[PDB]
Structures are given as structure tokens and as C-alpha cells.
């Protein structure tokens, strides 16, 4: 079972950062509003922190994901890495 919330939020966030329009005085606050929700979508249901080694149910669409330390889902892993690199690029450039 793939994660819809996570991928959707990654698309929104990446689209927001990479299309940052220098001229829209409202863009930065938008990115700032969307970023914590994207962060929430990839967090561990035990830790609270960002998923270390994601594991997901296959029978439902629970949207509930836990660490291996706490059925491995590759999409969730790639998305965690995506979050990390997007954060890295956000830190590197100024919006």
C-alpha cells in the first residue's frame, strides 16, 4: 500500500519551493504553512520524529507508518530522503 498523503504533500511542497516567485509577497508564508504538514505526513507513529526505516500495512490504507526499530515500504523511504534533500536545498537558497 502506497502513501497518498506523503506523495501529494511532497508534490505541493516541491512545487512551492521550486516555483518560488520573487514578486509574490505571500509565497514565503505559503511555503512556511505547507512545510510542517509535509513534515507531519512522514513522521513515526511511535517516535513522533521523521521515519527511520518505514514499515506499512498492506491490507488497509491506514496512513499509519512505523520504524523498523519500532512490510518495508520503499516509497516511504524515498520520500523521507526527498524531505531531507528538499530541506537541504531550502537551507542552501534564500526565499
Amino acid at each position: 500500500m502506497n502513501p497518498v498523503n506523503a506523495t501529494a504533500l511532497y508534490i505541493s511542497a516541491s512545487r512551492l519551493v521550486l516555483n518560488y516567485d520573487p514578486g509574490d509577497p505571500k509565497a514565503f508564508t505559503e511555503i512556511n504553512r505547507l512545510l510542517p504538514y509535509f513534515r507531519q505526513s512522514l513522521s513515526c507513529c511511535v517516535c513522533g520524529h521523521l521515519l527511520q526505516d518505514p514499515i506499512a500495512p498492506t491490507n488497509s490504507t491506514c496512513q499509519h507508518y512505523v520504524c523498523k526499530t519500532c512490510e518495508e515500504n520503499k516509497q516511504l523511504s524515498i520520500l523521507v530522503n526527498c524531505y531531507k534533500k528538499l530541506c537541504e536545498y531550502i537551507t542552501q537558497t534564500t526565499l
Binding site: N2, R15, L18, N19
Partner: protein
């Protein structure tokens, strides 16, 4: 140099994003068709029960 290259990478990146999105929509379609076929299958099973 690096401006045209990075500005090129940004565009190909956004395009890749659009692809990921369209694939997600396809996956959702597959989920709905599978679940529909599954309930339909389960109700078609009850046909054996009525012998």
C-alpha cells in the same frame, strides 16, 4: 554555465514532479478498480452458497 545548467535541472525537476503526480493518480485508479472487483467478487461468491 552553472546558471543555465541549474535552471535546466529545476525545469526537468518540475517535469519529473508532474510525472510522479500522474502516476499517483493512476495508482489511486488501480486501488479503486481492485476494491470494486473485490467486493463484486465477494458478492458473486454468495452465488455458490445458494445451491
Amino acid at each position: 554555465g552553472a546558471s543555465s545548467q541549474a535552471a535546466c535541472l529545476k525545469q526537468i525537476l518540475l517535469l519529473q514532479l508532474d510525472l510522479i503526480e500522474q502516476q499517483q493518480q493512476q495508482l489511486q485508479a488501480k486501488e479503486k478498480e481492485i476494491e470494486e472487483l473485490k467486493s463484486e467478487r465477494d458478492t458473486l461468491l454468495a452465488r455458490i452458497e445458494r445451491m
